[PDB]
Amino acid sequence: EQEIKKLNVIVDKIDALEDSMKNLSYEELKDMTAIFKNRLKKGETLDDILPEAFAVVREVSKRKLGMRQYRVQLIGGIVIHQGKIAEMKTGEGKTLVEVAPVYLNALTGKGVHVITVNDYLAERDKELMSPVYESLGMTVGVIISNQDPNIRKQQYKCDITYGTNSEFGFDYLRDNMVPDLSHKVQRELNFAIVDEVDSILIDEARTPLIIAGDGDEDLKLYELANSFVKTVKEEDFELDRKDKTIALTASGISKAESFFGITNLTDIKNIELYHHINQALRGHKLMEKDVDYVISNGEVMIVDEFTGRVMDGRRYTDGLHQAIEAKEGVEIKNESKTMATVTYQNFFRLYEKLSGMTGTAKTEEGEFESIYKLNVVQIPTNRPVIRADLHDKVFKTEEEKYSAVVEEIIRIHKTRQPILVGTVSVEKSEKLSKMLKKQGIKHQVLNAKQHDKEAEIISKAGKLDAITIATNMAGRGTDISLGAGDKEEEQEVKDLGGLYVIGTERHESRRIDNQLRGRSGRQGDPGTSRFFVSLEDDVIKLYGGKTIEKLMKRTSSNENTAIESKALTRAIERAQKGVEGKNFEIRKNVLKYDDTINEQRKVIYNERNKVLNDEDIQEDIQKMVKDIIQEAGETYLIGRKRDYYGYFKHLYSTFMPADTLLIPGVDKKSVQEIIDSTYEISKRVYDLKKMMLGIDKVAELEKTVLLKVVDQYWIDHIDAMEQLKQYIGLKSYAQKDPFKEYALEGYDMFEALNKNIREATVQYLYKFN
Question: For this UniProt entry, which segments traverse the membrane?
Fold first, then answer.
């Protein structure tokens, strides 16, 4: 309320400025982008310049679109500017509301992302609003699926880029899968306005964004690595049963490189081949059937050394399991491979400034503030809503209800009022449509299969004899104008009561119910809506409880008569809130599983970027080197009581070149100076490297390897964490939450990931120079 008064005082300022914009030329209006930037360099903030800048946009808007913004459109724009969700009904001009705040934030030159739910929408909307951004001297881009990358970076280069939610996501993952910084397509994730914020950020929130890779080579590599190991003789590898290491000897390397037709197997270029080879070796000579793993029902299964029983489910990490599949003649898995993933939720949280619009979001406000720091402001409508939202017409059976819907559509169709029928699936749409065809009724069916074609059709849905069956995801973003652009047909159809809205099922949420109603009664227009439902409908039947159960058990009487009573109405409403409650509670619970992989992922991506953008990673390599030494110090010199043979055999198999570990004074030399001394020997290995190749090649090599190693291990960790979620599905405990195991094991796994990266980076930089 006071909230609206505040917004209104700002709008008053825009209106005061109208007169002056009215008498400027086109070039004067366009010259305002430079006046705004220069003043921004001088001291004013976007908040200080917004009135005048909105005034510039209304004006260019009036002349170029012939759409002068209304007060409530400017209010929505200010809210969006605030990095909030403006709740605006269907027909309030969301697409237009976006132009002023977008334009305002595009002035920083940092870029702005206007997000849609699909390709057709993003292109249409950008094409439609381009004349105004261009008339203000800015450039607009757009991102869609059938798109050339070269064009892709350019779209992000414009001051403004349009695109659908998933493509801004896909691009982000790809940018963190790149080898060279100058391969990225994006700039900073600055500001994002998300359309239909509740379906995206709430309903679809968990949607995984996956960049996946083909298992073409993984399958040949696994096959080939296995037959190459099969020809290996004892003189080709050195193994240690006790400490479980196995490395190829020099003859092993030769047989290997001649076998695979390669030149230096240990060089970083062959990381992938070398890694599949070490796993076959290990799989073949360190693991044994009926001791380490068993084969049952055609699968390699892990034996728990704690009981000798199998670990139903669990798989070996880093290709080791496949290695054993090939080794045993078992079906290796051709499962699709995931190179990168992020959900909508975690992706939209990455923006410095977030925003959104929707027709209904106030009820989910707690969650929007909790998850994203988004608050909701309800923007009053331009005109009063007179659409009659009538009470549900209830039936005992689904067949009675559809039969009743066909008749209601006939009765109305005969008065030639247009009818929008809401449905919950392509299958319902077809059942309904086949029933209208039975009675000779012409109509159109929108299945959200082809947005553009569906769009021209939904636009004509406000015509005189219009009947349109629309699935819940068909025809969004297009307005249903009464009379389709004819003043005579519009007032006529308007005289008739506007668009008639019929729902054939209640949805999993009252919001979607409201979104179907919102299809009619736009901008002051008349209209009517009603829901036809029945006890057999999913929400009623799955969540309505004992009252419904009893009702469905009764002996069927009075076919086709509607049912009603207050107690029937309390149980119908209660059922809907039940699924709303459940869905809400499931969201909350999956959130902590999702946050855990999300927090891992931010650390690995920040690191990966630190590499991609330089600054300096040489100390980080020196920290990994020290790390490995401290750990070996702890495992062998302390855990095993100065087991020098093992301390050095371990450091040697890990990364140190042969015969370098000579320390005297050992035996009455503290463990720390044994680590300090060992480190100085490492520094001299690396001094030899710097003298042979030069500091530049050394620092660069660091870059090349750290990156290739992080990718190798992080793609496997991704898979291993998904496997972890799967396993904690089963075995639970009488203590507290399945989540606690999950977290504990996730943490141990995350430490195992970083231990792997360092040992492999460091080996590669130090062991084979």
Answer: none
